[PDB]
Subunit: 237 residues, 6 copies
Amino acid sequence: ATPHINAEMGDFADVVLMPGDPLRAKYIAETFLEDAREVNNVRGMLGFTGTYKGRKISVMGHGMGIPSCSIYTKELITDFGVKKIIRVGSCGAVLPHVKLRDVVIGMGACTDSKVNRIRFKDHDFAAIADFDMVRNAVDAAKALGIDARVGNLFSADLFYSPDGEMFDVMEKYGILGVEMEAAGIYGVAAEFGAKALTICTVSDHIRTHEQTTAAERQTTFNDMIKIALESVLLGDK
Amino acid sequence: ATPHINAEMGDFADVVLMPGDPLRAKYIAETFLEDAREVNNVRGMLGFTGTYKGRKISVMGHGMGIPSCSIYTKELITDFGVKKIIRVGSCGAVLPHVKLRDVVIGMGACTDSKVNRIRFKDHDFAAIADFDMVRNAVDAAKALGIDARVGNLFSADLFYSPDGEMFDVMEKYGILGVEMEAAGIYGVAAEFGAKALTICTVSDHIRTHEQTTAAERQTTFNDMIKIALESVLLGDK
Amino acid sequence: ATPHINAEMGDFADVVLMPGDPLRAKYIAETFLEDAREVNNVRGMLGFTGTYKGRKISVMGHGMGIPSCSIYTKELITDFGVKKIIRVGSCGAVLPHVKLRDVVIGMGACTDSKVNRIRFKDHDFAAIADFDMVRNAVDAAKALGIDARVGNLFSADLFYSPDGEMFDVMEKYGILGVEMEAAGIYGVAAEFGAKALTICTVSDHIRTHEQTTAAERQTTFNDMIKIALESVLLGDK
Amino acid sequence: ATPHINAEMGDFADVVLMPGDPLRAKYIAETFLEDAREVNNVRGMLGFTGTYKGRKISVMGHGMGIPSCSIYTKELITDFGVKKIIRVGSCGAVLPHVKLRDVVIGMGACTDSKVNRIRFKDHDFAAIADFDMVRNAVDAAKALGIDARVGNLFSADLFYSPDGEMFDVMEKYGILGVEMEAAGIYGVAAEFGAKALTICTVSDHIRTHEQTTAAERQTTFNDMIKIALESVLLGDK
Amino acid sequence: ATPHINAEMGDFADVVLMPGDPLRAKYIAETFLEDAREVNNVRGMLGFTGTYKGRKISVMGHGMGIPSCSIYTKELITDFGVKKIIRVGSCGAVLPHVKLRDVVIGMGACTDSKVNRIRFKDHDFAAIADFDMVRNAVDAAKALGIDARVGNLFSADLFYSPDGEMFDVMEKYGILGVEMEAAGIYGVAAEFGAKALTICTVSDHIRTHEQTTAAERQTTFNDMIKIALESVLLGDK
Amino acid sequence: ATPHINAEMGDFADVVLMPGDPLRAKYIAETFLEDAREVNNVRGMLGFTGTYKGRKISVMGHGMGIPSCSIYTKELITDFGVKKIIRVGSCGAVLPHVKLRDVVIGMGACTDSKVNRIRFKDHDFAAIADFDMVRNAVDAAKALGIDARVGNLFSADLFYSPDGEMFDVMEKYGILGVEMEAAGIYGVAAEFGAKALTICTVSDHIRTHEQTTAAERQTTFNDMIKIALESVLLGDK
Ligand SMILES: Cc1ncnc2nc[nH]c12
Ligand SMILES: Cc1ncnc2nc[nH]c12
Ligand SMILES: Cc1ncnc2nc[nH]c12
Ligand SMILES: Cc1ncnc2nc[nH]c12
Ligand SMILES: Cc1ncnc2nc[nH]c12
Ligand SMILES: Cc1ncnc2nc[nH]c12
């Protein structure tokens, strides 16, 4: 067991889907996994390991923000043999043509955090996802008839940012989604030798102001989870 | 209700104690509060409200990291009328003379994050606690016959930092403890006009390396909690 | 005509292959293009426009370093309707398993330059290539039976860097190739609304010290040019 | 003797009062101390030692700016056994509810200087005062009927700053006063393991020019000195 | 031979004039040098060696940008025994009183690049020319009856900068001209122990916007070249 | 009058000599000027005005550090019509071939201070002196048989810097002397359109402690003053 995960080598699959909310991980294990088994509950960060069309799969929340997910993704990679991490969460849109419920694949991740500068001697480190994983997700998406944009995300440290102007700069440079973890997960993966990918569903719109609503949430969310699970299968082949 | 808290104005007291672990919050409510009632469960971040010796008090977890605690404290202050926040957690030791089971009070907090620089035009903002709250905590500790150390804490973004040379620096400049939220909580308090304080017990010693396993460590964690509760009573006078 | 290119709207195709060396552009127009026509010679930066299997194509050098290529890629994009830029050059390897003559596709680009920080309010901008272009290049590569690694490149400002330690950091984070333009071309593309991709051939080895040699250069170089030209065709489909 | 102090060990007491202007050190010694003797005159920075109600105390000017005071506070601490330094001077205010002639105590000190970043691996160091010294001053003030405010100060490198928008940022974050030494002195104290405190009287209000007679000023200056001196006696208890 | 220069020790004189455009280099050789011979053609960066009034002199292009000129000047100094480098180019006007056809001498050079910070531990390194070379240039200009202005130049990484607010700043602090190499050439000279100087003629006015088209502008460019040639003669004495 | 100078327009000449220690301004005036009158005594920073061979000249101390001298040089320039400022002081050396008591002229000044970055949009500003003043001093030195060196100086914020490795970096880049004001004074001069120069004598050698009598020092100090004064007369020609 590690400082933040009470489990043992073997309890997790080599791939792990990770939403921010611990209750979402649970819902996922109950809606997409067979023989779901709870493997962790320290600090309430629920973790599950089951099967999907025969494939062993794990799902566990990672909390909010870079510092939080870095801890879990790190422990999973060094003490439980996890090879692939797949973040499945929500994000805020800045581009007018990017509407709600839209699915975005984070090929890269911009951030205003200092974690990567500390790792890269104060220079610019391009936090990127594993190419094959991105490719898998795009193909699984087409096979499901679900749209998907591939590009840059922005991992912010402050959900309530005092710098309003920064959103215009984001828009100008084509940021597809604003969240709070991608840049950190790519840093950890690169540092500890693993692969990662971040997939997000456009919740609210930073401009228009309007979060998720009705039953559209679940359906769109299920599409994201579906895309992630199928991408793992295309990767095993 | 706010994006991360499903409650209404009044469900929280004007004073909230915040441990990092939501399970630790339930522990506080059931151990020290009377007539406790759960007021939040969003994302599993349990929040409770009850009374201590007749005073209305609230306790709620804030997750790990500056980005996480920044959201919760911000929403409490601007949407729930909270005026005081008291973080109660654990920290890693840096100074040789700082022994285990020592109660540390963070009058100030150094940090690795750039959240405060975003706020302060890229200059040095000295993240500090509220003076009266610090004094109340020192007096409450004395009344209980407990020796409290007041000084600087260090708030890191990476629990698993890639540079160990930084620990000598923290020691050279007198940092009493290493945790992950103080600097962020103080930035929020100053940004939105509220008051905050961080109290910690030393759970490990990055120096001689010393974990913890005894009824004695659990006795000191409770002393810290009693120090926080009693200090609010002193403040009301 | 623009300040650095004496030509007119229509002289360039909507796609342009760009090596660093002006003499290479010429060699390319003479070895892979039909009806090659010189369209520019200002400052000696030779530019050509011809045909490849029917497709209109242009090839022009961009000089050495971020400041140099930013100027040309900018003018091509705003005054000659260029839609896609494809850099084809050399790079130094840092990873032991990455040997000479190897072909690398730059999905992302790290840099120690300040150009992107100036554009992104001093935060971390992840300089990335267009996903489809990367995908096209990988497929064209498999079709030619030529190996190709997809990942991060490092765009350096100083060929003769005084910071030797930085190469160990590069290696640690998996940098596949060290060159001097990618990070800038991705910045310009994002700023002016175009698409770009950088493909490099591993020349010397920053560690072992041994640049190109014999006739292996041309053959491997021709493979790179072939991959780039075929990727454009897969993109038209 | 030291580069800037022509004296030997034992000439200075373990507690030193330091005003900005050197002419004030002469006034302090003849107005509050008994049996005073001169201990330094280098560069015209007069230094005196004597007693206040039987307590051995020294007083000497530190000049203007972080660099200047860092020279003196460093030499006093490592070469003359000084344990406590108390800066007594004036400051400009930015907060409306902070009246002219108010007494401000610096529990913390923000700054636009780079000295602390150079010391703290380019991270955020929270330059704070010794807590007991802060409470001593507060209680001495109360005992003298003088009410004082405790909070942040801002140590500027440029009295005539090119940026006027920073004062807005200061007001927003509750800065009580602007001067030019606290953050520097607090850094030195932490570097060599000593204790420090900065006390200031609002002499200017960077808002609407007010007016005060020369008599009022002298009266306020004496109050500040009394506070400093009585707080030392309280700390001895 | 070096990575970018195909010549042997002796092919270059101990003094090399360097214009940005290699075609401009051929122009210099054929217009002012006697018995000129091409000594380099790698990547099309033409270099020549001949004599001026009996003195052996060399002239060679350095490309656009700090990264480009840094390579060539470095290789000349460490592998070809070159002791002096004199850049002769054009610059954009900033100050209203700085008219077209004014010869500007860069005693110092501000910059946008971070190359010198990499060199100087992230501090401020004042990139300056060699004093004797500056004086020789002023005297040579006087002898020719030409008015030379000595001061600061600004070396930019982006000819097409995304911020125009920077031009007011350059004007406020007296920058005489804007180009793209001076700061880098001075860094190299200091790093490898050589001497350098940058001379420029104003080709445009970013102020009132003024290009150039007259036999008069070509007359001033030649005056600059004669100033550089004659100044070396004064130095030999 | 100004915040730090109790005098009116016309009291200071258009040229001001400024030593570090205020006691020296008294010596300069009685030793080199005729018909001297006192013009300032605030904070003990004595100011004098008089004539040297019919030339009206003023002298006054500027204190230690960038912050202090920035105060005085700013007020003299914008409130008393001062056109030229000449700092005369001492410095430590790092270069072996730079002997003790040598005369160094600062054509440029590096620094680890942040004042200029704050002025120059966080970019590199090359803090340089007025060229004519530099040549005047050189020629005055030659005329007096005194040989002087022209080059870079380093203006430190911390006399007792925590980093000892920076001195190696300084030596490598040819820094001639270390002091604490030049870069600051040069910034102010550029900000308000005036001229400045810094002249220093090597009083220390941060290498191997040497020795010099008190008589030798006085002799060297007078040489520096003569240079400064004669250079002013030359500039008038
Ligand atoms: C404004 C904002 N910032 C970061 N993550 C988010 N998810 C939704 N909205 C968000
Ligand atoms: C040992 C250690 N390192 C970094 N952050 C911590 N929080 C608690 N303990 C810690
Ligand atoms: C060392 C180095 N740096 C940048 N680009 C290169 N191409 C080959 N070697 C290189
Ligand atoms: C009024 C004022 N403004 C700025 N810095 C100061 N230091 C002391 N007093 C000051
Ligand atoms: C107008 C302009 N802007 C930036 N760099 C330049 N070099 C020459 N002219 C220039
Ligand atoms: C010897 C020495 N060292 C560092 N800074 C200085 N300023 C003046 N003299 C100095």
